[PDB]
Amino acid sequence: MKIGIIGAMEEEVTLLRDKIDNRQTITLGGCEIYTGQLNGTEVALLKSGIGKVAAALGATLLLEHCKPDVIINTGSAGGLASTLKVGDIVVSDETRYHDADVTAFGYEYGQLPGCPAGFKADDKLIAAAESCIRELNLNAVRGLIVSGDAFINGSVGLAKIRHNFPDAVAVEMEATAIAHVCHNFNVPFVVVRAISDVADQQSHLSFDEFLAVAAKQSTLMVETLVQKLA
Amino acid sequence: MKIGIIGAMEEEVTLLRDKIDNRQTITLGGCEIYTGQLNGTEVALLKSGIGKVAAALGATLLLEHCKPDVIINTGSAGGLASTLKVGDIVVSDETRYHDADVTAFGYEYGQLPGCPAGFKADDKLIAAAESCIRELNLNAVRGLIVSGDAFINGSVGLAKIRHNFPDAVAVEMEATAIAHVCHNFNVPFVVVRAISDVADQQSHLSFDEFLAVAAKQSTLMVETLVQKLA
Ligand SMILES: Nc1ncnc2c(CN3C[C@H](CSCC[C@H](N)C(=O)O)[C@@H](O)C3)c[nH]c12
Ligand SMILES: Nc1ncnc2c(CN3C[C@H](CSCC[C@H](N)C(=O)O)[C@@H](O)C3)c[nH]c12
């Protein structure tokens, strides 16, 4: 089995990169792919850069060159569910764009022409993720994760998302793009992130302080998940 | 020499596809690529689907499989510049995301981390496209084109774009994502689109009525430009 992992930032992939045995690096299209074994399992870890287009480009390359059986998207997120604290885990059961709007032609808000309104994560991946959270005794929320090309920092940006997607448990900037690419290539996908901030007026400060903690916890989950899937 | 051409919709690529000699089709990742000769010049034409992610996925696949020397993005657009009427031509000198916002971390509005604030179109491609405009006797504006994952339909959506990007001459949903991917692969890029609507409260009705006109005019431009380039 070959597991694909994608993260956006250096801080989000660096801990996992260090655990890869017999690691080799490729650079292409501004993305770095690190291949090798993580605790015996073949992985390919991509550092995509930030936002929807950087993620889609990275995901397409990973699929085409490394042909993984599944993809796991890791890193930080903004917490929207009230029970979430910094460091806690969020797992996607679904992803939607919070900033897509073709409602003039009668599409659902967030839906793009030719796409489902939302991309459902793979049930088996979700089940395995849940079993890891339980084994590690971590606090987690499963649900809808929304993505857009905006860092959410309270005020109107946050209000708009809460209004349009009241069931969204977290916000980030890459997940739904990776889900979209995976849908088109029919490859199983899941998001396993950790909370760096709660996307409010303090989110820029919380994010700076807690990105490292979010990277540490998401890395813990992802390596536990890789081990379970094998 | 091989010219890459990317369009989002069936209507925007059907006229050009019908003119390809020795036409071979490839399907992958939800996208169709048609390869062959267009009046003796080798081309690869991709039908991407709609929006930033679909366009990025599409562009990445074209660049990887077909290795084109340049990319031309064609199709329709929403006119913003006062002199544009339905069917008139817009040529990118630059593209920017109108919906990207990481200003909380000090970036310019529309800039994503790790990216320039705008992507400059290739000077040689622009000059060729200006000679096509002249040869075909068309009305055209060269300028900033902005992209986002929304169909612009008047109200506050339009006011926001006009305020943030008062020099934008047109708006659409794919161009900047393609410019971004081309940037990352160091491939020359230009947008050559035709106006289907003026992005106001009637833009959805104007689009339905004038998509075929915009497609015909952009096709005329693209066929000419391919010849000029070879
Ligand atoms: N509040 C939030 N809104 C959107 N995304 C997130 C995230 C997830 N990712 C974190 C990251 C934030 S943008 C980082 C910019 C960075 N400080 C820089 O200056 O380059 C982007 O890849 C999305 C955590 N909190 C968020
Ligand atoms: N006013 C406008 N706003 C944003 N983009 C455009 C465009 C260019 N593209 C045209 C196309 C509009 S979305 C088509 C919806 C389609 N009729 C449907 O019902 O599935 C998308 O690829 C962006 C023309 N006018 C625009």
Question: Token digits for B62?
Answer: 């074209």
Separation between Cα atoms, residue A192 and residue A173, nearest integer Å = 14
Query: Are the Cβ atoms of A53 and B181 closer than 8 angstroms?
Result: yes
Residues of B in Cβ contact (< 8 Å) with A184: 29-31, 57
Q: Give the rounded distance of the alpha carbon of A193 from its chain centre.
A: 6
| Cβ atoms < 10 Å from Cβ of B156 | 8
Helix (H, G, I), strand (E, B) or coil at A58: helix
Question: Residues 6 or more apart from B87 whose CB is under 8 A from it?
Answer: B194, B195, B210, B213, B214, B217
Full 3-state SS string of chain B: CEEEEEECCHHHHHHHHHCCEEEEEEEECCEEEEEEEECCEEEEEEECCCCHHHHHHHHHHHHHHHCCCEEEEEEEEEECCCCCCCCCEEEEEEEEECCCECHHHCCCCCCCCCCCCCEECCHHHHHHHHHHHHHCCCCEEEEEEEECCECCCCHHHHHHHHHHCCCEEEEECCHHHHHHHHHHCCCCEEEEEEEEECCCCCHHHHHHHHHHHHHHHHHHHHHHHHHHHC
Domain ranges of chain B: 1-230
Residue nearest to atom 5 of ligand 1 (CA): A172
Of A65, A12, A56, the C-alpha closest to B55 is: A56
Please tell me the distance in Å from B204's CA to the nearest CA on chain A.
Answer: 6
Separation between Cα atoms, residue A1 and residue B150, nearest integer Å = 39
Surface-to-core class of residue B189, CB atoms within 10 Å of its CB (0-12 exposed, 13-18 middle, 19+ buried) = buried
Task: Decide: A37 and A48 in contact? Cβ < 8 Å.
Answer: no
B12 is catalytic: yes
Query: Are the Cβ atoms of A54 and B180 closer than 8 angstroms?
Result: yes
Separation between Cα atoms, residue B109 and residue B107, nearest integer Å = 6
Q: What are phi and psi of B215, to 5 degrees?
A: -65, -45
Separation between Cα atoms, residue A87 and residue B218, nearest integer Å = 51
Task: Decide: A81 and A142 in contact? Cβ < 8 Å.
Answer: no
Residue linked to tokens 């020499």: B1
Cα distances (Å, whole numbers) of residue A164 to A27, A146, B87, B101? 38, 10, 35, 18
The residue type of B133 is I
DSSP type of residue A88: -
Of B20, B105, B70, B46, the C-alpha closest to B228 is: B70
Please tell me the distance in Å from A185's CA to the nearest CA on chain B.
Answer: 5
CA of B175 to the centre of ligand 2 (A): 12
Query: Are the Cβ atoms of A113 and B185 closer than 8 angstroms?
Result: no
Task: Decide: B36 and B3 in contact? Cβ < 8 Å.
Answer: no
Of B215, B180, B113, B193, the C-alpha closest to B145 is: B193
Helices (H), chain A: 10-19, 52-66, 123-136, 155-164, 175-185, 203-229
Question: Token digits for A177?
Answer: 């793009």
Residue linked to tokens 């400059």: B120
Which CATH number among 3.30.420.10, 3.40.50.1580, 3.40.50.620, 3.40.50.300 corresponds to the domain A1-230?
3.40.50.1580
Surface-to-core class of residue B192, CB atoms within 10 Å of its CB (0-12 exposed, 13-18 middle, 19+ buried) = buried
Task: Decide: B49 and A183 in contact? Cβ < 8 Å.
Answer: no
Task: Decide: A7 and A24 in contact? Cβ < 8 Å.
Answer: no
Query: For residues B104-117, b (16+ Cβ closer than 10 Å) or e, as one string?
Result: beebeebbbbebee
DSSP string, A96-126: EESS-B-GGGTPPTTPPTTS-SSEEPPHHHH
CA nearest to A200 within chain B: B104
Question: Token digits for B148?
Answer: 């986002």
| Cβ atoms < 10 Å from Cβ of A106 | 8
Separation between Cα atoms, residue B63 and residue B71, nearest integer Å = 9
Task: Decide: A78 and A11 in contact? Cβ < 8 Å.
Answer: no
Query: Are the Cβ atoms of B56 and A60 closer than 8 angstroms?
Result: yes
Query: For residues A132-153, b (16+ Cβ closer than 10 Å) or e, as one string?
Result: bbeeeebebbbebbbbbbbbbb
Mutational test site, ligand 2, from B6, B48, B86, B151, max ligand atoms within 8 Å of CB: B151
- The minimal CB distance from B153 to the residues A63, A97, A104 is found for A104
| Structure-determination approach | X-ray
Separation between Cα atoms, residue B109 and residue A123, nearest integer Å = 38
The residue type of A62 is L
What is the distance between the terminal CA atoms of chain A, rounded to a whole angstrom? 7
Separation between Cα atoms, residue A35 and residue A28, nearest integer Å = 14
Question: Residues 6 or more apart from A24 whose CB is under 8 A from it?
Answer: A34, A35, A36
Of A58, A61, A22, the C-alpha closest to A42 is: A22
Separation between Cα atoms, residue A2 and residue A71, nearest integer Å = 9
| Cβ atoms < 10 Å from Cβ of B137 | 6
